[PDB]
Amino acid sequence: FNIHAWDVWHDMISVRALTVDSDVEIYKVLKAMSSAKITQATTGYKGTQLKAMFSLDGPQIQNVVFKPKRYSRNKIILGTPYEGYDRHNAEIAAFHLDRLLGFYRAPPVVGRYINLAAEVLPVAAKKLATTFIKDKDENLCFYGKCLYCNRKEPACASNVTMEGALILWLPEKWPVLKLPHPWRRTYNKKMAKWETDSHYCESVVIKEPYTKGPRLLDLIDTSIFDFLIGNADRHHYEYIENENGSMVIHLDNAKSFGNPFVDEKSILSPLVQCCRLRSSTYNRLKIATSNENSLSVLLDKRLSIDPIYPILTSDHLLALDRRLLLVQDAVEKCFKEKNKENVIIEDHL
Amino acid sequence: EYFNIHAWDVWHDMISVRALTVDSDVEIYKVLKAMSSAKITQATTGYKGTQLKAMFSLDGPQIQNVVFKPKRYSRNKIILGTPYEGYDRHNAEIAAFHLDRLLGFYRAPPVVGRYINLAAEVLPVAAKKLATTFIKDKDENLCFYGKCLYCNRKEPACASNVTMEGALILWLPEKWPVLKLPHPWRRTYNKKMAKWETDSHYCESVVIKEPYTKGPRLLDLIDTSIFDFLIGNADRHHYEYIENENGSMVIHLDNAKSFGNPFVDEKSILSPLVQCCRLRSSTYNRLKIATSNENSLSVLLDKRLSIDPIYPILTSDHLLALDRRLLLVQDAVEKCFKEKNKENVIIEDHL
Ligand SMILES: OC[C@H]1O[C@@H](O[C@@H]2CO[C@@H](OCc3ccccc3)[C@H](O)[C@H]2O)[C@H](O)[C@@H](O)[C@H]1O
Ligand SMILES: Nc1ncnc2c1ncn2[C@@H]1O[C@H](CO)[C@@H](O)[C@H]1O
Ligand SMILES: Nc1ncnc2c1ncn2[C@@H]1O[C@H](CO)[C@@H](O)[C@H]1O
Ligand SMILES: *[C@@H]1O[C@H](CO)[C@@H](O)[C@H](O)[C@H]1NC(C)=O
Ligand SMILES: *[C@@H]1O[C@H](CO)[C@@H](O)[C@H](O)[C@H]1NC(C)=O
Ligand SMILES: *[C@@H]1O[C@H](CO)[C@@H](O)[C@H](O)[C@H]1NC(C)=O
Ligand SMILES: *[C@@H]1O[C@H](CO)[C@@H](O)[C@H](O)[C@H]1NC(C)=O
C-alpha cells in the first residue's frame, strides 16, 4: 500500500492543473517536503534574487528551491510596486490562495526551519558554501551567488536555524517555457505603452498566442491573482504545454504581501483594458464574495497547517478581502461599458 | 509533527450522496492500509442477522467500527443448489469492492482482507457475548460460531491454529444513515415463482408506484443488477441506499453471496435491465470502454486484487467468468437496442 510522495507529485500534474483538490494527496506531498533529508545543496540557475537549491531524499531525488526569510512578518515595503527582497511567507500564502480560488496552477510550497549547520553545510556545493558568513551577532548567514547578491546583504538565521520556504520543482516531463508579459513594467522612470494607451488590449489580441486559445484568459486570471497578493513583478510569465493545450502557471510569487495598505490597481490592467474574463473563474469569485466566511478567514485556516505559521499578519489577510471587492468593482465596470454577455467567456476551462 | 490526516477522517470526508469511495488511489490505499494494520480495541457479535460475522472496533483518534466476515470455504469451493445458498464468502466482498471501483460505480464501502490472530488480537478485547462462542475443532483449531439466527455450535468458523483469515468492511459514519426497501425483483425463497418470473412486461408495474417513477432509483437498481450479475449475487432481496437533500443512491452493501459458481451465469439477476430496457448513459459509456480495452475485465480486476494481503482472492475460473458475463450484458443491452431504439434506451440524467 506504499506510494511515495514524489510519485504522487509526478502523476498529479495535467496540462490544466498543477495541484488537485484532494487534501490527502497534497498534504502527503507537503509532509514529504517538510521532512525529507537534504542530500545536496547549491545556488541554482541564476535569477536576480538570493535562493538555494536543495535535493531532497527519496527513491528518486526531488529538487526544491529554498527562499530564506528576509523581512519581519510586519515589514511595510515602500517604493516601486516591485520593491524589496523575495518574501518567503508570500510563496506559502500564494500557494494556498492558488488552491483556495480554484486555479491549481502553483507548485506546492511549504515552510521549514532549516538547520544550516547540520543539514546544509555538510552537503553544500563549494559554489554555495563559499558565501557563508557570520554577522555581528555571530549568526550563521549566507549571501549566495546571484545578480543582486553581495556580502553586505545576506540572509541570516537565528543561531543556525534559518526559516524559509521550499518550492517544489516540476518534473522533467513538464518543461517550463517563458515569454515576456505584454503588460510588463518598464523597470525605469519611463512609462510602458499600457500605462498611456487605454486601448492597449486591442493591440495585443492581434499577435499570437493571444489571438486565440487560452493564453489571454490565463493572463487575466493571473492578473487577478497577482493583484490580490500584490505581485507587480510578473514581467515574464511562464507556462507549460503538451498536446492537450497550455496553461500559465503561478511560479515565483515571492514579490507579494509587501504592503497591506496599498492596492496596485495597475496589476489589474489585463482585466481592466481587455474586459474579458473566463467564466469558470468568475463563478468562483462570486462564491468567495458570497460565502459566509470571508476569503481571508478561509485562507488562514489553510495557512494554519504550515510549520512556520503565522504566515500573514491580520493586515495582509484583511487586504485580500478589500482587494477582492476592488476586483468585483473592476469586473462590474466592464459589465457596464460592454455587457456581461460580452465580458464573461466560457471556454470550458 | 505536521500535515497529518487520519484515515478514519479521510473515510468520513470521502462520502458524497453519489459516491462512497473516490478515484484517488492515494486516498483509498491510505484507508485500506489503516484497516489492515489498525489494532483491534473491541470485538463482539450481535444476536441479529442470519450470517456469522464479528464487529471490530479499530483504534485511532476516533474509534472506527468494521465488520469482520471470516473465511468459511476453500478458495475453489463450488456452491450449487440455489442461486443464493451458502455462507457469506469473505473473498467475494473483496473482489466485489474492487470491481465496484473498476467499473466506476463507487457505491461499495472499502473492504480489505486480513489475517487475524484470534488469540492475540480478539480474545483480549472480546465481549463476553462473543467469547462464550469460542470452541475447538477435531484438529484443535481455534473456532467460534457466534450468536446469530443460523449460528450454532455445529457450524463454526475455524482458523488455521489461531490465525483466522477474513474480510474487514468499513462501517459508514453516523451522518450517512442506511435505509432499506424491498427490491422489486425479489426472489421468492421457495418453489413459488415471483411475478417478474412469469410476466415479461413486469417493468410497467414498478414505474407506476414511487419511488421508481421519478429520480435515479430505478436506474440505480439497473446499475446494481449489472454489477450483481457480473459477480453472481442473486441474494439482493432488500436493497439499501443513503439519502440527503441532494439526492439518493443505492449502495453496494453486503456483496458476500457472490462468486459462488464460475460455470453458471444467472441471467435472472439482469431482469431489471432486460425487462425495463433502460440504462444510465454514464454507465453505458464505462461498459463500452471495458469491452474495448485491450486488457479484459478479468486482467484489470486481478491487478487491483493483487494488492490485498490475502491475495489470491479469486480462482482463475471466476475471473474468466467476468469477461464472459460482461459479453452477456452487452448482448442484453444490444437486444434492447433492437426492440426499442437506442435513443429510448440510454437515459442521460448526468449521474
Ligand atoms: O536586492 C533585490 C532587488 O530586487 C528587485 O527586484 C528585481 C528587479 O528586477 C526584476 O527583473 C526585472 C527584469 C529582469 C529581466 C527582464 C525584465 C525585467 C526582478 O524580477 C526583481 O526581483 C527589487 O525591486 C529591489 O528593491 C531590490 O531589493
Ligand atoms: N519550481 C520550478 N520548476 C521548474 N522550473 C522553475 C521553477 N522555478 C523556477 N523555474 C525556472 O528556472 C529558472 C529559475 O529562476 C527560471 O528560468 C524559471 O522560469
Ligand atoms: N458498512 C455498513 N455500514 C452501515 N451499515 C451496515 C453496514 N454493513 C451492514 N450494515 C447494516 O447492518 C445489517 C447487516 O446485516 C443491515 O441492516 C445493514 O443495512
Ligand atoms: C545558540 O546561540 C548562541 C550564539 O548565538 C550559542 O552560544 C549557543 O551555544 C547556541 N546553542 C547551542 C545549543 O549550541
Ligand atoms: C491528454 O494528454 C495525455 C498525454 O499528454 C494523454 O495521455 C491523455 O489521453 C489526454 N487526455 C484526454 C482527455 O484526451
Ligand atoms: C500453532 O501451533 C503450534 C503447535 O501446534 C504452537 O507451538 C504454535 O505456537 C501455535 N501458534 C501460535 C501463534 O501460538
Ligand atoms: C448539497 O450540495 C450543496 C451544494 O453543492 C452543498 O453546499 C451541501 O453541503 C450538500 N449537502 C450536504 C448535506 O452537505
HEC string of chain B equals CCCCCCHHHHHHHHCECCECCCCCHHHHHHHHHHHHHCCEEEEECCCCCCCCCEEEEECCCCCEEEEEEECCCCCCCCCCCCCCCCCCCHHHHHHHHHHHHHCCCCCCCCEEEEEEEHHHHHHHHECHHHHCCEEECCCCCEEECCCCCCCCCCCCEECECCEEEEEEEECCCCCCCCEEEECCCCCCCCCCCCHHHHCCCCHHHHCCCCCCCCCCHHHHHHHHHHHHHHHCCCCCCEEEEEEECCEEEEECCCCCCCCCCCCCCCHHHHHHHHHHCCEEHHHHHHHHHHHHCCCCHHHHHHHHHCCCCCCCCCCHHHHHHHHHHHHHHHHHHHHHHHHCCHHHHEECCCC
- Does A28 sit within 8 Å of B2, measured CB to CB? no
Atom in ligand 6 nearest the alpha carbon of residue B140: 5
Nearest to A298 by CA among A105, A109, A104, A99: A99
Residues with Cβ < 8 Å from A329, sequence gap 6 or more?
none
User: Residue A15: how many CB atoms within 10 A of its CB?
Assistant: 16
- Does A27 sit within 8 Å of B5, measured CB to CB? yes
Nearest to A175 by CA among A247, A255, A122, A91: A247
Is A72:A167 a contact under the CB 8 Å cutoff? Answer: no
Q: In angstroms, what is the C-alpha Rg of chain A?
A: 20
Active-site option among B228, B235, B265, B308: B235
Nearest to A253 by CA among A44, A67, A43: A67
Report residue A191: phi and psi, to 5°.
-120, 135
Cell digits for A182? Answer: 505584454
Task: Give the count of alpha carbons within 13 A of B264, CB side only.
Answer: 17
Vertex A291 angle, CA A285 and A295, to 5°: 65
Is B235 catalytic? The answer is yes
Give resolution, Å, one decimal: 2.8
Report residue A346: phi and psi, to 5°.
-100, 105
Atom in ligand 4 nearest the alpha carbon of residue A138: 5
Which ligand does the CA of A159 lie closest to?
4
First-to-last C-alpha distance (Å) of chain A: 34
Is B118:B135 a contact under the CB 8 Å cutoff? Answer: no
Distances (CA, A) of A196 to A190, A199, A269, A273: 11, 9, 12, 12
Question: Which chain A residues contact residue B23 at CB under 8 A?
Answer: none
Report residue A97: phi and psi, to 5°.
-65, -35
Cis amide linkage into residue B156, ω under 30° from 0: no
Which amino acid is residue A95, in one-letter code? F
Which amino acid is residue A236, in one-letter code? H
Report residue B131: phi and psi, to 5°.
-65, -35
Ligand 7 neighbours, Cβ below 6 Å, are B 244-246
State the Cα–Cα distance between residues A287 and B308, nearest whole angstrom.
Answer: 42
Residues with Cβ < 8 Å from A79, sequence gap 6 or more?
none
User: Residue B244: how many CB atoms within 10 A of its CB?
Assistant: 12
Nearest to A258 by CA among A112, A74, A97, A93: A74
Nearest to A262 by CA among A191, A315, A331: A315
State the Cα–Cα distance between residues B215 and B243, nearest whole angstrom.
Answer: 12
Residue B291 Cα to ligand 2 midpoint, Å, equals 44
Vertex A92 angle, CA A89 and A96, to 5°: 140
Is A312:A295 a contact under the CB 8 Å cutoff? Answer: no
State the Cα–Cα distance between residues A228 and B97, nearest whole angstrom.
Answer: 45
What is the residue whose three cell numbers read 443464493?
B84
Sign of the torsion angle spanned by Cα atoms A121, A122, A124, A126: positive
State the Cα–Cα distance between residues B37 and B85, nearest whole angstrom.
Answer: 32
- Does B4 sit within 8 Å of A34, measured CB to CB? no
Question: Which chain A residues contact residue B2 at CB under 8 A?
Answer: 31, 34, 305-307
Q: Kindly identify which residue of chain B lies nearest to residue A26, measuring between CA atoms.
A: B3
> Residue B3: which of A8, A22, A30 has the nearest Cβ?
A30
Sign of the torsion angle spanned by Cα atoms A221, A227, A231, A235: positive
Which amino acid is residue A166, in one-letter code? L
Method used to solve the structure: X-ray
Is B333:B278 a contact under the CB 8 Å cutoff? Answer: no
Ligand 3 neighbours, Cβ below 6 Å, are B 49, 67, 109, 169-172, 178, 180, 240, 253-254
What is the residue whose three cell numbers read 518598464?
A186
Q: Kindly identify which residue of chain B lies nearest to residue A302, measuring between CA atoms.
A: B3
Is A111:B3 a contact under the CB 8 Å cutoff? Answer: no
Cell digits for B254? Answer: 453486503
SS3 for chain A is CCCCHHHHHHHHCECCECCCCCHHHHHHHHHHHHHCCEEEEECCCCCCCCCEEEEECCCCCEEEEEEECCCCCCCCCCCCCCCCCCCHHHHHHHHHHHHHCCCCCCCCEEEEEEEHHHHHHHHECHHHHCCEEECCCCCEEECCCCCCCCCCCCEECECCEEEEEEEECCCCCCCCEEEECCCCCCCCCCCCHHHHCCCHHHHHCCCCCCCCCCHHHHHHHHHHHHHHHCCCCCCEEEEEEECCEEEEECCCCCCCCCCCCCCCHHHHHHHHHHCCEEHHHHHHHHHHHHCCCCHHHHHHHHHCCCCCCCCCCHHHHHHHHHHHHHHHHHHHHHHHHCCHHHHEECCCC
State the Cα–Cα distance between residues B218 and B206, nearest whole angstrom.
Answer: 9
Residue B63: left if φ>0, alpha if ψ -120 to 50, beta else—which one?
Answer: beta
Distances (CA, A) of A101 to A95, A228, A270, A324, B57: 10, 11, 19, 11, 39
What is the residue whose three cell numbers read 514581467?
A235
State the Cα–Cα distance between residues A183 and A196, nearest whole angstrom.
Answer: 12
Which ligand does the CA of A158 lie closest to?
4
State the Cα–Cα distance between residues A319 and A261, nearest whole angstrom.
Answer: 7
